[PDB]
Amino acid sequence: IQGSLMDVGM
Amino acid sequence: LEARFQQAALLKKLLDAIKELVTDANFDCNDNGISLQAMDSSHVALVSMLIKSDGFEPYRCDRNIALGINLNALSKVLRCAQNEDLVTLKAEDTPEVLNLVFESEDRISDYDVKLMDIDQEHLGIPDIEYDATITMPAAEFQRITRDLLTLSDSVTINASKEGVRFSCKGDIGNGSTTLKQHSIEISLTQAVTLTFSLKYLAQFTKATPLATRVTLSMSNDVPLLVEYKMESGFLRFYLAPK
Amino acid sequence: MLEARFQQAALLKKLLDAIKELVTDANFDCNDNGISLQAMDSSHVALVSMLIKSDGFEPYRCDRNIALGINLNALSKVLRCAQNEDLVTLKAEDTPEVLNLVFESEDRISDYDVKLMDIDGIPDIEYDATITMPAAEFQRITRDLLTLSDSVTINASKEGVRFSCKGDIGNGSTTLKQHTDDQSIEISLTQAVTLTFSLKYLAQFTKATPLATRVTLSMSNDVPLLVEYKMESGFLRFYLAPK
Amino acid sequence: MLEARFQQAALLKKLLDAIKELVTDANFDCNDNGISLQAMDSSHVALVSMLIKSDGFEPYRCDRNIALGINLNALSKVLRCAQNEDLVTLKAEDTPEVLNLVFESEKNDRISDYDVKLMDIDQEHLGIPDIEYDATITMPAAEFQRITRDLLTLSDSVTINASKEGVRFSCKGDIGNGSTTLKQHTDLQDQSIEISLTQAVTLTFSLKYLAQFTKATPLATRVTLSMSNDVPLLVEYKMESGFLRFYLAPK
């Protein structure tokens, strides 16, 4: 399942 | 604000690439040029535009302005221009309407697009060290993502000495295409393996007509960077892995 | 007994393409001077008038005056079975219950029968303003404006001629001046006229674009617009009521 | 073990385009002589017979005789992932539960490898042995496409008359009725209409089916129709290294 950019820093 | 382009086709093509993915956005105009940065509805992908002031003939933006626009509305209006035509963007008293004028050499059309109000935000883009990067024909990246999408919802991408590899699994079956260092340039500092939605990659490949080459950049647990470079600027997509 | 032959089948095809989406059934009124058609759309907003003169036929012969009721789709379907290069021949017997067509290109030969049906006044005017321009430009403008709104307003003055929209997207105008280069925009004004028209209808009229490289619009206040496409050997005309 | 390679991937694509609308599932029967397919449509009205001879393969080798059950849409999807320029390679195992395809740029840049899941199909025989036909026509594939296209807009069925006097295709429909006829005629050659008659024949056929057969148009510039009374029509498209044939029952 997909995760958001907020999850990778941002 | 007064800015003029040699050709109206390149404005058309930008909007075609962005509009499916972003419905509303602020075009942030400076002395340096016009830029845009926005998320998709779901906060999975991010777009960043830049048309430098180099790509304009008599370009002039005194103070800094933000133009909120429905990108479909803008695209509709831009379709009324011939590819050969001379676009001129004007924004004068209020950020309430954007004026466009198309001409040639020879007749004149002009249109007004109603603006809207969008909010200011700054998603900070941590610039960085990408463990692997590929550059290849934009056309082939389009072909592959097109083809893979007919087999499944997701692709996984492997970067190694073997080359770069795009892999599916779906109901029809499964499989992969791989590219090596032949034109196709690669540079890995490490191996990286990530998985992405092919729905989003397919939307990014609508930028294909803006540039004959494309660049993908990766690192573990870091959004993928798909970059299309133009003269006097760029278009970039950032995609979160699954 | 009617017998009429055309050089080119592509021209008959093109006429029907322009008319059929606007008029479903119509009488083709044949006489000594040629074949003509006059009909309204479903809603009585627009009117079409055809004329192919007998000049545009090789052996043409229409003994007496007859009226051929035809479904124009049916006719178009059948006409699509002809090559553009082919020699059309129209034949109708003294009765008549069917229209006969024969296509030949020197040599396959095809011939078809179209079932007929029973189907049921233009004040000539001098118009205050008229424009003639490339048919292709009138098509592009109406095409483009229709994507923004349902109606265009048209202004004629010595400022030139102006086509204006307003819609939800925003709005647009394009304006044409008196330039003299079949690319020249000719204007002729006796007084200023401003009218508003449905772009749905104008868009349907521009399907006639392939019949002629030039088009002519004619106006007067509170009087239907006249869009005219002229051909060697006759004409096609559209009359549209303002809003 | 089956390993067969083609100098091009476009012809494979084109075959499947012609067949898949008419047949959803089929066995590809592989031999020493090549790969062949014989199948009916859903309604048992029409029959297709493929043949790609082993001539049209570079290192072709099929040790034992194998039958590969495939959904033809699935196969077509996967074959669209190959460039026209590309080098296709088909590989199967002795089980087998999957067909492997590999497309190499071979010019040489990218290499793509796919697996198509197979299925199980009733190895049913159908019979259509050879016949000499009372009349035969050969003409541009393009014209046969044009005519069937055009006639289908007027009606569901065409009747075909062969005689000394040329071949005649006739409609009757609601719009009206009519016919096109083709005479003997020689271009001196792809544009020519050759006719060969031993006996006059007149038969009626569904234009729905003939229209589907004309999707084979890009495989060959010439097409051949063969007839006899109360006997299925034979529409044949010939290729270097085999053929595609359609048999249609009259009404």
Round to whole Å and give the CA distance between C162 and C164: 6
Method: X-ray
C148 touches chain B (CB under 8 A): yes
Query: In 3-state terms, what secondary structure has residue C80?
Result: coil
Is the Cβ–Cβ distance between B60 and B89 less than 8 Å?
A: no
DSSP classification of residue A4: -
Q: Computed from CA positions of residues D218, D219, D223, D228, in that sequence, does the dihedral angle turn out positive or negative?
A: negative
- As a whole number of angstroms, the distance between CA C174 and CA C145 comes to 9
List the resolution, Å: 2.9
SS3 D142: helix
Pairing of strands B86-90, B97-103: antiparallel
The contacts of residue D5 (CB under 8 Å, 6+ apart) are: D57, D58, D59, D60, D87, D88, D89, D90
- Tell me the CB-side half-sphere exposure of residue D25, using CA atoms within 13 A: 11
Alpha carbons within 13 angstroms on the beta-carbon side of residue B231 total 7
Residue boundaries of the structural domains of chain C: 1-243
Strands (E), C147-222: 151-157, 160-164, 170-176, 186-189, 193-198, 214-220
Is B151 an interface residue toward C (CB < 8 Å)? Answer: no
What is the rounded CA–CA span in Å between residue B235 and residue D144?
A: 49
What SS3 state is found at D124? coil
Please tell me if residue C173 touches chain B, with a CB cutoff of 8 Å: yes
C partners (3+ CB pairs within 8 A) are: B, D
| Of B123, B197, B241, Cβ closest to residue A10 | B123
Residue B222: closest CA among chain A residues belongs to which residue?
Answer: A8
Q: Among the CATH numbers 3.40.50.2000, 3.40.640.10, 3.40.50.80, 3.70.10.10, which is that of B1-242? A: 3.70.10.10
Neighbours of B110 (CB within 10 A): 17
Concatenated DSSP letters of C118-146: ----------SEEEEEEHHHHHHHHHHHH
Contact criterion met (CB below 8 Å) for C171 and C164: yes
For chain B, say whether C171 makes contact (Cβ under 8 Å).
yes
Element at D100 (helix H, strand E): strand D98-104
Identify whether the C-beta of residue D209 lies closer than 8 Å to the C-beta of residue D215. Answer: no
Minimal CA separation from A10 to chain B, in Å: 5
Beta-carbon contacts of residue D43 (< 8 Å; ≥ 6 apart): none
CB proximity D114 to B under 8 Å: yes
Asked if residues D159 and D204 have their Cβ atoms less than 8 Å apart, the reply is yes
Query: Do the Cβ atoms of B223 and A4 come within 8 Å?
Result: no
**Which residues of chain B does C164 touch, with a Cβ-Cβ cutoff of 8 Å?**
none
Residue B146 sits at φ, ψ, to 5 deg, of: -55, -55
- Which one-letter DSSP state was computed for residue D214? G
CATH topology of domain D1-251: Proliferating Cell Nuclear Antigen (3.70.10)
Identify from B21, B40, B44 which residue to disrupt to test chain A contact, counting A C-beta atoms within 10 A and taking the largest count.
B44
* Phi, psi angles (nearest 5°) of residue D155: -160, 175
Answer yes or no: are the C-beta atoms of C94 and C88 closer than 8 Å: no
**D168 touches D178 (CB < 8 A):** no
Tracing tokens 């909007």 back to the chain, one arrives at B15
Q: How many CB pairs under 8 A join A and B?
A: 34
- Residues in D touching B151 (Cβ below 8 Å): 77-78, 81
Tokens read off for D57: 């393969």
Numbers of helices and strands, H then E, in chain A: 0, 0
What is the least distance, in Å, from the CA of B91 to any CA of chain A? 32
Which residues of chain B make contact with D115, given a CB cutoff of 8 A?
173-175
Are D238 and D220 in contact, with CB atoms under 8 Å apart?
yes
Write b or e for each residue in B53-79: b if 16 or more Cβ atoms lie within 10 A of its Cβ, otherwise e. bebbeebebeeeeebbbbbebbbbbbe
Q: Do chains A and D touch (3 or more CB pairs under 8 A)?
A: no
Residues 6+ apart with CB under 8 A from C199: C142, C145, C146, C149, C150, C151, C152
Is the bond into D96 cis (omega within 30 degrees of 0)?
yes
User: Which fold, C1-243?
Assistant: Proliferating Cell Nuclear Antigen (3.70.10)
How near does any CA of chain B get to the CA of C224, in Å?
A: 26
Interface contact D181-C110, CB threshold 8 A = yes
Residue for token digits 């379907």? C77
Task: Give me the amino acid identity at B226.
Answer: V
Q: List chains adjacent to chain A, taking adjacency as at least 3 C-beta pairs closer than 8 Å.
A: B
Residue of D nearest to C70 (CA): D175
Q: Alpha helix locations (H) across D62-138?
A: 72-79
Inform me whether the C-beta atom of residue D182 falls under 8 Å from chain C C-beta atoms. Answer: yes
Q: CA-CA distances (angstroms) from residue B85 to B7, B10, B59, B81?
A: 6, 11, 17, 6
B–D: how many Cβ contacts below 8 A? 49
**Nearest chain B Cα distance for residue A1, angstroms:** 6
3-state SS of chain B is CEEECCCCHHHHHHHHHHHCCCCEEEEEECCCEEEEEEECCCCCEEEEEEEEHHHCCCCECCCCEEEEEEHHHHHHHHCCCCCCCEEEEECCCCCCEEEEEEECCCCEEEEEEECECCCCCCCCCCCCCCCEEEEEEHHHHHHHHHHHHHHCCEEEEEEECCEEEEEEECCCEEEEEEECCCCCEEEECCCEEEEEEHHHHHHHHHHHHHCCEEEEEEECCEEEEEEEEECCEEEEEEECCC
If residue C205 lies in a helix (H) or strand (E), which one and from where to where?
helix C199-205
Whether the CB-CB separation of C161 and C204 falls below 8 Å is answered with no
